A paper describes a structure:
We were able to subsequently confirm the GT-B fold by having solved the crystal structure of EarPPpu at 2.3-Å resolution (Data Set S2). Indeed, the EarPPpu C-domain includes residues 184 to 361 and follows the Rossmann fold topology, with six β-strands (β8 to β13) and seven α-helices (α8 to α14). On the other hand, the N-domain (aa 1 to 153 and 362 to 377) could only be built in part. Yet, the structure has a higher-than-usual R-free (35.1%) value at this resolution, which cannot be explained by a simple absence of disordered regions. This is likely due to the N-domain adopting different conformations in different unit cells, causing crystal disorder. Similarly, TDP-Rha in the EarPPpu crystal structure is located in a binding pocket that is composed of residues located in the C-domain. F191EarP, F252EarP, and F258EarP side chains form an aromatic cage that stacks against the base of the nucleotide moiety of TDP-Rha. The sugar ring of the nucleotide is then specifically recognized by a hydrogen bond between the hydroxyl group on C3′ of the sugar and the side chain of Q255EarP. The diphosphate is recognized by hydrogen bonds formed with the side chain guanidine of R271EarP, the Y193EarP side chain hydroxyl, and backbone amides of E273EarP and D274EarP. The binding pocket is closed by the bulky side chain of Y193EarP, which may sterically ensure proper positioning of the rhamnose sugar. The rhamnose sugar itself does not seem to make any contact with the protein and is solvent exposed.
The recently discovered arginine rhamnosylation activates the polyproline-specific bacterial translation elongation factor EF-P. EF-P is rhamnosylated on arginine 32 by the glycosyltransferase [name]. Rhamnosylation is mediated by the recently discovered inverting glycosyltransferase [name], which utilizes dTDP-beta-l-rhamnose (TDP-Rha) as donor substrate, resulting in α-rhamnosyl-arginine on the acceptor EF-P. Unlike with the common and relatively well understood glycosylation of asparagine, sugar modifications on the guanidino group of arginine appear to be rare, and almost nothing is known about the molecular mechanism. The enzyme is composed of two opposing domains with Rossmann folds, thus constituting a B pattern-type glycosyltransferase (GT-B). While dTDP-β-l-rhamnose is located within a highly conserved pocket of the C-domain, [name] recognizes the KOW-like N-domain of EF-P. Based on our data, we propose a structural model for arginine glycosylation by [name].
Numbering used by the authors: 2 to 11, 13 to 43, 53 to 58, 73 to 75, 85 to 87, 89 to 99, 127 to 128, 132 to 146, ...
């Protein structure tokens, strides 16, 4: 087996999130001997002029997605110049979402009592100066909302909105139509089960951004608060004028401080269109070979 060496350091997850995902895939789907040299805090993984792959274990080892098409270094894009996608991910997604008890088991395994008839929204982002306006919109809606919030950089402003004491793992609180719930940091695979379970997934960063695209449900992105509108140029292509406008107002507002209430309600006026659009994007994106295959076939043909 060929030898591959990856090294990630660290602003935190996302660097290890991408490297830990890629390292398992090159072992599992390509039978490679890879060692992830993490420099900072399912396996078989041993964790310029003119990713290290050649084997040398010397101490002084110096013994040797987002323009983007022109840079052929990392080479991770949305066009024919890709994304990390496990071979059986889409199949594992469909079997999970088509089994009613599997959906019930995972939710109940995380201490979540689903509000009957409620829209289920996962939110995982940085500090957004518009969280308060969005939660005011959900709380004032005439249909219930169940919000699942993993432990992270958003529970701070979440607490400042509810106004009570500090919130940690386990606390679940209701205001009007919105019921807020704080989740722990589970496993990467269970985070996929989370995305597959909710009707709307608010992600951020790099990997969860793509993981939610494979989830196939309506989603929202929070980029390290330039490259936002370049993502929407491809994402918005198929929708009608009313749905296109509602998706632009939704995503720009979450990143440029425009009213989260007006945008959210506008997008909800076109939910069947947005639901189908999210499914069609995942199927279109998955039609291209994944990144792990793109890294392997390139090395097999040398250069
Ligand atoms: C919420 C949650 C996330 N995760 C995973 C999702 C990914 O694997 C990883 C999250 O990383 P990302 O999705 O890329 O979001 P991120 O914000 O953590 O990553 C980003 O940080 C910013 C400062 C910069 O854009 C870069 O540094 C980028 O790495 O954590 C879990 O495994 N379990 C969880 O419960």
């Amino acid at each position: 087996k060929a030898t591959w060496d990856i090294f990630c350091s660290v602003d935190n997850y996302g660097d290890i999130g991408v490297t830990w995902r890629l390292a398992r895939q090159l072992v599992a789907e390509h039978g490679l001997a890879v060692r992830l040299w993490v420099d900072d805090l399912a396996d078989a993984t041993a964790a310029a002029w003119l990713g290290a792959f050649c084997q040398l274990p010397a101490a002084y080892v110096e013994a040797m997605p987002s323009n983007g098409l022109r840079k052929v270094f990392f080479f991770p894009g949305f066009t024919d110049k890709g994304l990390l996608r496990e071979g059986s991910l889409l199949a594992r997604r469909d079997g999970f979402q088509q089994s009613a008890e599997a959906r019930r088991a995972f939710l109940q395994g995380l201490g979540v009592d689903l509000v009957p008839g409620a829209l289920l929204i996962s939110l995982f982002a940085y500090e957004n100066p518009q969280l308060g306006n969005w939660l005011d919109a959900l709380a004032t809606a005439d249909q219930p909302c169940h919000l699942l919030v993993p432990q992270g950089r958003v529970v701070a402003g979440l607490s400042q909105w509810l106004g009570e004491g500090p919130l940690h793992v386990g606390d679940v609180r209701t205001r009007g139509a919105l019921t807020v719930q704080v989740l722990p940091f589970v496993s990467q695979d269970d985070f996929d089960r989370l995305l597959w379970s909710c009707d709307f997934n608010a992600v951020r960063g790099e990997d969860s951004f793509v993981r939610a695209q494979w989830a196939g449900q309506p989603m929202l992105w929070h980029i390290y608060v330039e490259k936002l509108e370049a993502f929407l140029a491809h994402y918005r292509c198929g929708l009608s004028d009313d749905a296109d406008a509602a998706l632009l107002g939704l995503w720009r507002a979450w990143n440029m401080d425009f009213d989260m209430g007006q945008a959210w309600r506008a997008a909800r006026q076109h939910w069947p269109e947005l639901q189908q659009h999210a499914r069609l994007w995942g199927a279109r994106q998955a039609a291209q070979p994944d990144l792990a295959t793109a890294l392997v076939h390139f090395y097999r043909n040398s250069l």
